Scaffold this active site. Structure first.
Site, PDB file in Angstrom:
ATOM      1  CB  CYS C 378       0.504  -8.624  -4.348  1.00 20.11           C
ATOM      2  SG  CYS C 378       2.022  -8.020  -5.116  1.00 20.11           S
ATOM      3  CG  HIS C 514       1.262 -13.003  -2.113  1.00 19.27           C
ATOM      4  ND1 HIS C 514       0.670 -13.333  -3.313  1.00 19.27           N
ATOM      5  CD2 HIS C 514       2.006 -11.898  -2.353  1.00 19.27           C
ATOM      6  CE1 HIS C 514       1.040 -12.465  -4.237  1.00 19.27           C
ATOM      7  NE2 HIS C 514       1.850 -11.584  -3.680  1.00 19.27           N
ATOM      8  CD  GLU C 516      -1.763 -15.720  -1.902  1.00 21.42           C
ATOM      9  OE1 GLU C 516      -2.099 -14.927  -1.004  1.00 21.42           O
ATOM     10  OE2 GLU C 516      -1.371 -15.338  -3.020  1.00 21.42           O
TER      11      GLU C 516
END
Lengths: 527, 542, 542
Positions: C378, C514, C516
């Site tokens: 990001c 993202h 993750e």
């Protein structure tokens, strides 16, 4: 007009209500005020005399002859006031007295109830225990939320209502836990405890936060705002290196200032010089000695609180760190006395029960043969006498009426089988007759003393002269000389066996001559 | 396996916990089941014997000799079982025996607490009271929310947990009030009471709603929904015209069906023919009398519950509406016996205290001299003997040692005072500390043949319940006997005077024991029935 | 029929309600059952998107595009299901939709109350979240005793009543503290929490006891007796060495056996081979690297939970212990890049706020120039683009419109600002009020062949989760492209820049999305695995 400070517990027990109350009492004593303390137990046992040490630790004995809660001991160790049966009582005593009054018809055909009869009796007993003291600290056993402590809480609420805020405060001890997974302390259980207190009409005035990790300022602000309590009335009491430093920490937070402001008292500033001396002599020792301790339940919670406190006082009067080695008697029985080698002194205190006494017999034998400073207390003198009869007078089967009755030589026994059948119940303070030139005289430096006793079985005078001519010294007897009280060995550097419990009068700010002499003998041995 | 039904109170007291429990027990008895009931009082009085009637009404006396709560009386009047001291107990007795156990060392150095020691004692006493009964109804005194009843509620919660729903129920009595300003009944206090019950781990299984106004179906649906109980488990018990119809009322709502379904009992259908007969003969009388009762606290709440119940039983056994005139003895003292005119019979029962005995003396005198049927109980027989000695034998100052110990003619006194005495006023005073002088409980009584008491009881040897300390002085009894005072009944061994009679009276019986304690609605009492028939004879005739 | 397991907290917060619930769900998934989980937050925030990380940690982003509680992440990491907005909701949303329903008149002139309207809404949302799952684990935020969670507890109580014990359980998490001064653990706070639960009509069926010290058997027996639960229903969950072993721990205490026995489920025995592999490869690493992460609030409680979890997953997939150096960006600003020396890789994740972006710019510069593997997320890609424009193209004042709107080279900005612009600083400012500029949730992404991101993901078109407003300025992108900045991935339609790469770097990938959030412990993530292997390549070599 006497004023009262109430102390309560929260979340979990074993917070240290008694220690905090005694610390406050010491702080206000340093200000010149005459302080007294009371303990209220929320169990229906009439007195803690029947209670085993597994439940609430040791059974302290006061001078007037009462078996009380161990917290009273802390009281006597933090102020120089003698505690009596009026300063400790239980729900069972209240209920039994009210039942006896109701059977006597003193209520005149009225429905006797928890309110107001039980609360009236509790209040009357609290006022009676307070006496003429300027400030009385009443500690409430148990934790709030238990239905056992509700009568006490209602009684203190009634007192607070009746005598106003100028004569009553609520110091609530609560635990803030450190959550390892979160890396911070939580105030939520404290808020729950405060809500529980509010639901019963009690608003705490001071909060004592207990934790094993530091309590930061933001948590104090949150706990003060979420309980509607002034900020400076949030005292943080963490796990400390020694209890005697607690009065300092509290003083550093101006809690005594809060007390005097609320009560409108006029007295001088607190002088904590003596407690500073105690903490300095505790955290900074110079010498070092290891003393053995043999009994039945050594590391049990507060089982021998007064004894360990007394030995700490003895080591603090001589600037020695008294390391302690606790060995179970059964370990000595099933492994031999070889576990005792390397120590500089050996102690045999009062045993709880009847198991493993032959271990103590072997212990006193080893202590006396190897010339290691030995001090026996209650059961200690009994086992010392039995062993001395066994190994000097040769009576191998000599024993006491407590244990196996297959003993042709009862050197210690009940009076009734001499000269069932009830019990002597030798409890409370009593007068003493020391002997001149003995170690006991060398320590007490007088011939008349008053000490407390909790025994029932005494030394049989029938076989006494035979031991007396066998070398056994009789260094002390009763207030009239009828019974044997303390004995000594003739060819020992230091060997005293006393029937009474001297650890109850030992204080940190004054020590105890007998325990100090024992410590000095331990240093003389090796140190 | 014994099964238990628990009864609790809510909102306010005086809901009728005992009456509802006894009615349910009567319903179950009509199904053939062997029922028993227990009363648990949340006050620390050891027994209610010392308690004044101002607090919780009369003090019942059981056959085995125990002073218990009045609710036990209801029990014996609704099922045909006999209550003992195991069927009523208090927090005080539990605490005292637990303290004695702790002093004995029976707990072996343990911290004695409310949980579990007090709860264990309460549960053991509940089991001992239940006995071999198929169903035991355990009633809890007080109202839910008081801290006094918390041990009992905890004990019954533990019982529920331990024996399961197949052996336990909770029938909770609640009050739905009629708000006049709103013209409807409110369920809010009941919901709050149920919340208080839920806070202590107790979920009611049956709700008995009490009101002075009808309980409509929508209120029942709301009260079942807001407390998570089935609709059929909400019972409406309104103020009734007579209590003996409650067994019918509840039976119309299937409460016994609920009990049988939950407990898995197999028994015959309920047959309430006896209770139907009772309610019909109580609500539809044919004759009518007016009987005076002079006493101490007449209109006090449940102070003379057993005696008024006995009068009701005597009236229903004769289909007579026994209207009752309650007169204070002090009123007779200060106004004269003219308050007694117009009655058909006169009663002097046991007196609560020592004030105004002269009024009862004058009442006995007026009843005897004017041939008005008289029945005396405990103090009634004593004042009858005193008055007879005063107005026949001429002993003006004759009294009882209870009131006048300086009387020269103590015709009534304790046994020790005149046991071995020369005569006249050989009263040893000193309060005669014996304690056991109080005759209590069931004792035998031999009845002389051909007397009124023998005509009523119809047996030579009867058994009745005593609660009294002062007896008839045997050192002066022969003079009374030869003066005309009939001794129609003596003790089981004949040593003491039990019931006396007038020589020229239509009906004059004075009994030392209390017959009202063994009086039941379905069987009546021969003594009270004879007294009421004597009043019927007096009525109209005089 | 759907079955529900409720999860509650006690004593204090941060017990691990979500972790325990997810572990139980993983256990049940190992038995073949189709599990789902729900999170109910007792705060009146409509969604946690506005909430700062200081309050309750990170803000998870689901595939369907909802900002939810971080606990949902745990869910997706313990069972292989996907969470939607129906699996997490708050008191605020319930109240707002109920208020909107009342304003619409959908209640038809009825008094809208917490009971039953709010409880009905909560129950309906629970059912909608549960879906077709065999078992749904509904977790309640907060701690029992707070007035904020009372509606949720009442709703689950109503569910328990309505569907019975065969479709409902209560697994209550409690804390037993170790009192150092007493040398033992105390059960009193747990008993108080159970009392609070009983006061609201909720009886726990399983107790999960949390402590930092071992929970001995006598404590379990006492805690089962004092709360009236079976002994096997007391589970000891202590602080563990890794969370992935909790499914084993609980399975050793027969918790899944309890769930199956109560719900009457028929399924195969639990097979935890995958979790055994995970715990073995996490607790026994063979290699080791040290990766720097520079950010804003690095060591804050659960602020970057998903990203640290992704790093742990990448490490276990390579059997490498990824030690992590947390460095504040302001520290780099005031001390220089010399704090970065010695690391094998450098990370710049999404930043919480606007302070210290220049530090991250310098971090990207140091990572690129010294050939130290870099991955940006990001804000990482944004600062990478800014730094590349500054230090290659010579645009010293190049920035993002987030931080500097007066920059002459806004290489990063909102779509509206440069959508139709002449060039250079044609920023329309006015804050670009659109609201929907925030790309949220799952979106497609086309990967150019032969790039690092294509080597990792191994597919031409991928799908990933976005939470970002500022995009790459396409009006200046060609200059960056011809300056050497590789555009290795674009949006699902190719209009916007997604992932960029350095031209002469061993490993330099910056993704706008993202990754993750889709990283799991049993499957890892190709991007994080490639980044960790690049660090392994750097380790030792440089």
């Amino acid at each position: 007009m006497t004023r009262y400070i109430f102390v309560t517990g929260g979340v979990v027990s074993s917070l240290g209500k008694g220690i905090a109350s005694a610390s406050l009492a010491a702080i206000l004593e340093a200000r010149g005020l005459k302080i007294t303390m009371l303990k209220l137990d929320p169990y229906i046992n009439v007195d803690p005399g029947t209670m085993s040490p597994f439940q609430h630790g040791e059974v302290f004995v006061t001078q007037d002859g009462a078996e009380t809660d161990l917290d009273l001991g802390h009281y006597e160790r933090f102020v120089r006031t003698t505690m009596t049966q009026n300063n400790n009582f239980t729900t069972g005593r209240v209920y039994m007295d009210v039942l006896r009054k109701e059977r006597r018809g003193d209520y005149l055909g009225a429905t006797v109830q928890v309110i107001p009869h039980i609360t009236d009796e509790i209040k009357r007993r609290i006022i009676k225990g307070a006496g003429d003291a300027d400030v009385a600290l009443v500690e409430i056993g148990g934790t709030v939320g238990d239905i056992e402590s509700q009568p006490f809480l209602e009684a203190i609420r009634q007192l607070r209502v009746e005598i106003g805020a100028k004569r009553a405060m609520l110091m609530h001890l609560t635990l803030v836990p450190y959550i390892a997974t979160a890396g911070e302390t939580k105030t939520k259980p404290t808020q729950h405890s405060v809500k529980e207190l509010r639901s019963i009409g009690l608003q705490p005035d001071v909060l004592v936060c207990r934790s094993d990790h530091p309590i930061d300022v933001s948590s104090r602000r949150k706990i003060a705002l979420f309980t509607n309590v002034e900020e400076r009335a949030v005292i943080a009491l963490e796990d400390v290196d020694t209890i005697y430093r607690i009065p300092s920490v509290l003083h550093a937070q101006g809690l005594d200032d809060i007390v005097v402001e609320r009560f409108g008292l006029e007295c001088g500033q607190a002088d904590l010089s003596e407690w500073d001396r105690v903490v300095d002599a505790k955290l900074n020792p110079e010498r070092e000695v290891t003393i053995a301790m043999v009994g039945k339940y050594m590391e049990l919670l507060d089982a021998y609180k007064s004894l360990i406190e007394a030995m700490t006082h003895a080591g603090i009067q001589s600037r020695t760190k008294v390391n302690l080695r606790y060995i179970d008697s059964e370990d000595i029985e099933q492994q031999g006395t070889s576990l005792l080698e390397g120590v500089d002194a050996i102690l045999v205190p009062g045993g709880f029960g009847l198991r493993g006494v032959e271990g103590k017999i072997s212990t006193v034998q080893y202590a006396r043969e190897n010339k290691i400073p030995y001090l026996g207390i209650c059961l200690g003198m009994q086992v010392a006498v039995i062993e001395y009869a066994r190994n000097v007078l040769g009576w191998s089967d000599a024993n006491s009426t407590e244990f196996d009755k297959s003993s042709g030589h009862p050197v210690v026994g009940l009076i009734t089988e001499w000269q069932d059948l009830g019990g002597t119940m030798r409890l409370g303070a009593q007068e003493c007759q020391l002997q001149t030139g003995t170690l006991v005289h060398d320590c007490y430096a007088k011939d008349v003393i008053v000490e407390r006793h909790r025994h029932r079985y005494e030394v049989n005078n029938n076989l006494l002269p035979q031991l007396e001519q066998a070398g056994l010294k009789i260094s002390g007897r009763s207030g009239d000389g009828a019974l044997v009280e303390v004995v000594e060995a003739p060819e020992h550097p230091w060997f005293v066996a006393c029937q009474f419990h001297p650890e109850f009068t030992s204080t940190p700010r004054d020590g105890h001559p007998l325990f100090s002499g024992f410590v000095n003998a331990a240093l003389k041995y090796s140190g």
